[PDB]
């Protein structure tokens, strides 16, 4: 038997493993980071909108702070969010780009002076002060009203990632790619580490280890359209859900972007619409006014999916090979425009596309983009199954809820690599293994034989029909607009997908480098992750965030003011097990209340929501009139805990 | 922390050692062989008088068997062995010979024709006839009756561990060197591993394993003139030793060699003496004629090295800088002799006592050799330790007992490094370990603390003149010619230097690559070592084998038909604790007689002896008259236990 022991097993190599490693290598405690590919591939390298972060250095970032963000947060969730949680996330984000910044991430700087800019209310000039001059810039991205979005000319993702797999690999961090987890190793409750596949060999290894973190980016390719690279799968999810210990989070809580590129799904930064793009229907009639006379285009991005998916229904929608579409008209911002503030887009357009965005159109559909379920945890990063961790997409630390900001993951992916490595650190250090190698050998053997009988398999399934008419039924039936009789219809659907996966037969035979064999195991877990996605779709019978349910349009905080906790207790089961977990309203420094975006009055009150919100604005009142400063206010509302590494206040221009 | 795993940790690169990986990798157990050195660089590699195995294919080795290979041991052993071990290994002796030949070991092949021999009795010629052609040959050595040692010309060591070393290249087994074991991993009486530390970086790593056996040969190095190589420092012994549980068996049973060369201790093999050496005193007197007028210098090994002492004791030594000594002349056998079948001894004279042994004579004194002491096990090579296994000079199988036969050492090795190989593998695959991270991070920091201490040390006493004079001790003390006053001497100095040990002091504060260091740690566990040997010869009143005390000159039968046992319970104790394990007279194959060599009548007779000795001779009476064969009749007087795949017999040249 092949046996490899760490300290601390990190299972991803994106913006949240790579940083969790950094924080328990730093300890001295020997730590390996998996990845299915080289780390520095990782779907965190593509995000090109920006890190959201209070630094309130520029003008149009003057004013803004740890409650500001926070309150952003909450809203935009939906009231989904664990609040504590959120506290944790904004007063470490600032740390977070300081520390980037230190470690060389090239941030676009503010240079004092003048500047061209867009603000559509007053789309003005701005000046920029010459104690700004040299500072980290920030710019208007995620619908908040202080723009707090950092970033590194149009590639943030790709320099974040570069920096903190640099410091993995400046610390001796064992980095081992082509390295899959296909399982977990637990018993008594507690996870002892991982069966991996080497994907090169095919050889099957335990990873031992006093603490495992999984950090495996989100689920997006369960879908057919997708903005995901090809590896976001969720077989992460998958190995916690198959445990039947650990409890996946609001795996219905997914958020699609408006104007990814179709039908490639490659994105087209949200900057288009923000720069005073236009989104054009089949006649070329500019539609967006027709529904949001006021904020037209530049409404929600929530909305504009929305409208968009709703003006295809009326029938408006332009017809294709692949599907339907929309346009992006972005010719109408000029030409040098493009070339210099969009000259990202326009390669884009050109170079898959086929297009040049200053002269023609570029087809766009709303396609699914961010995963905020996960697996569950506590504020730790700690799930059900004791030593196992989790952060970044792949989790449900849950400080996104319904609705996560735009801007807010990968600040979460490092911020959570921050925190949950810290007491993913203290846990690794003070915890004592008894490894049983009668356990290993089973959990080892149990898979050598599952490989070996899907290689042997005489099953008549064909694995990529399987898989593909997965992802139609989730992109049919789960996607912006919902409904139980379609929904009904997809878990069924699904659940037939399920039982036929087992029935597969490939032709290679080979148990190395094989992406046969690769899909063979890997399509099952899919169709689990897909089962909780659609079954708690179908099972919340309300609208919040992300998740809208035609048939029942209201957010119901009476009896929906919760988190979905899906689980596989029993192998032989072919359905999710659902149960909920509630939002206490007593720990709310928030209380429920209208989230900005959307119809007003569209959510069912809860009473305990009044009684607390009265109960906040007494606390307010009282404290404010004592001289008490907005931090002694805040931990009189709902105190939070931090690792003591990261309890000290963020300095700001202006102190 | 860092931790290695396997299922089969082997600790000792020598012929044992290398077996014994063989025999476990080739299942499918992944296996470690931790070594000091290269695996070919063990003493091992030493080895030019040859194999012992009963092939019975020369003409002067006709009719051996099973049975007289077995008698010669027995006998040999002056009954301190266990005669089922015995037994185990005859019959497995003649496979390893053949296992080894089909592995490439080019043994010395039979011609047919005359032959011009000595057999100093009629040195008369020898015919091989026709059918013998291109067998496996034999000469004379160990003074057995039937020639049975085999050879590969002059490096017969050389090949054998060549051959066995490259089986486990072709296997993939794991070999790493320039690592020492230094602490034994154990928790509730079973061993999981070994500490081990890289001589080159100085890291201390753990080792886990289902099964862990020590085969890192003998512990001559104790002596000031020994034929070990200079890595023969009996630690692996004092490793077992300090778990306070495995016990030694015989460490006061040491073998020495005649004519080693003065003072290098590079042997000068039996050969010389065989084809007609003659030993010379200063006055360049022959006198071996004078204390064995019938045998002379062909008299027992045994009896040689004692009578040369005598000499030297009577004043007819020759006085050198380095002490007293003896001469070798073989310039008498010819110039022409030596350079045929001597030209290797021809090269040792020259290349280090920078002499040419045609014309002139070779200071030699009888020194150090073999230890028959090592690790106690059972039949299967397993210590009191559970899951501790050992095999080779290292242990105490206890098939030599007082005195092995030379050629049955190497051959134990190989033979050890199958039958207890089987019995190891089949341990490590069917026992369940519980791996406790706590109880491995004890050990680990627990030795981390240890080397820490060492560099630390405000000691003054000098490591080496610890060593040195350690060593003055065993070579004056526990020689040839013990006696209770002088051993008791020798046990109180070298508890004495034990203590001394620990205020040792070095120059070189590094970790990594640092002799001094590593002589810090292996003193004390030399002295501890040395401590059982001595204190073993202080408390066995009697003469047996090669432990013989001149104030308790006969072998008592009555009161020391048994094995010493040495443990270290205590950590605090400065001596070893010495226990008796008795032999069985009745579980005796042959009952205690007469050994062949000596005087006769010196021993004490046991009247079990007597009573055995004629159910012996009815048993075989009544089984020999009904027409059995000698197998039958050897299963109703001992039956033993062999692994499957060694029970089956052996074909010879006249079935
Ligand atoms: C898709 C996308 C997302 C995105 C974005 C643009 C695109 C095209 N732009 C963003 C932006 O401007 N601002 C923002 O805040 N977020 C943006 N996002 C989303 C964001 O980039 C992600 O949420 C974030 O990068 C996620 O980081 P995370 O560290 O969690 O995950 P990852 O980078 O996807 O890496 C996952 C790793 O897991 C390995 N893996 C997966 N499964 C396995 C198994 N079974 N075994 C072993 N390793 C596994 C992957 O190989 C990878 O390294
Ligand atoms: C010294 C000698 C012995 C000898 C001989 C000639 C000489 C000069 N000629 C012989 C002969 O003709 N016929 C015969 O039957 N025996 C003869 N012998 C004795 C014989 O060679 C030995 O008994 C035999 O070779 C012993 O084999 P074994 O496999 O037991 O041991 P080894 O070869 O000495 O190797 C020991 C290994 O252990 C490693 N080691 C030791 N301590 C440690 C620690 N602490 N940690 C890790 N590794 C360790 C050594 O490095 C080595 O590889
Ligand atoms: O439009 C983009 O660049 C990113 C959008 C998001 O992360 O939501
Ligand atoms: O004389 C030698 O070559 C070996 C002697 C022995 O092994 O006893
Ligand atoms: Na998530
Ligand atoms: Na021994």
Redesign the interface.
Known sequence: ?????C?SLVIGGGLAGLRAAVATQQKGL?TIVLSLIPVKRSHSAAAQGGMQASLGNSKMSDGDNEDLHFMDTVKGSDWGCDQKVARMFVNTAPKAIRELAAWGVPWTRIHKGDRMAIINAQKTTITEEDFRHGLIHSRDFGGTKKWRTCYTADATGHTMLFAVANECLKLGVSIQDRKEAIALIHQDGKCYGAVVRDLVTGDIIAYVA?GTLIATGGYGRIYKNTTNAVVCEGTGTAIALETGIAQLGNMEAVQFHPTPLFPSGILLTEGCRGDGGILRDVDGHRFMPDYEPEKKELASRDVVSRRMIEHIRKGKGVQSPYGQHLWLDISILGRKHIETNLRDVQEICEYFAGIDPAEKWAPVLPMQHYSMGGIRTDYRGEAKLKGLFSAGEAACWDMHGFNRLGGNSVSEAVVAGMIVGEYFAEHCANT???????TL?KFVKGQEAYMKSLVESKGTEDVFKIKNRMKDVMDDNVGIFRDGPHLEKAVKELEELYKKSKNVGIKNKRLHANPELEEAYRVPMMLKVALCVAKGALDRTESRGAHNREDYPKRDDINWLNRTLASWPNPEQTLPTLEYEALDVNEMEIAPGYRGYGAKGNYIENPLSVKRQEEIDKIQSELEAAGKDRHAIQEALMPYELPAKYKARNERLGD
Do not use: A, I, N
Request: no cysteine; hydrophobic share 25%; charged share 45%.
């Open positions: 038997m092949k046996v490899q022991y300290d020997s006093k004592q293994v008894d490894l049983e190698t009668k050998e």
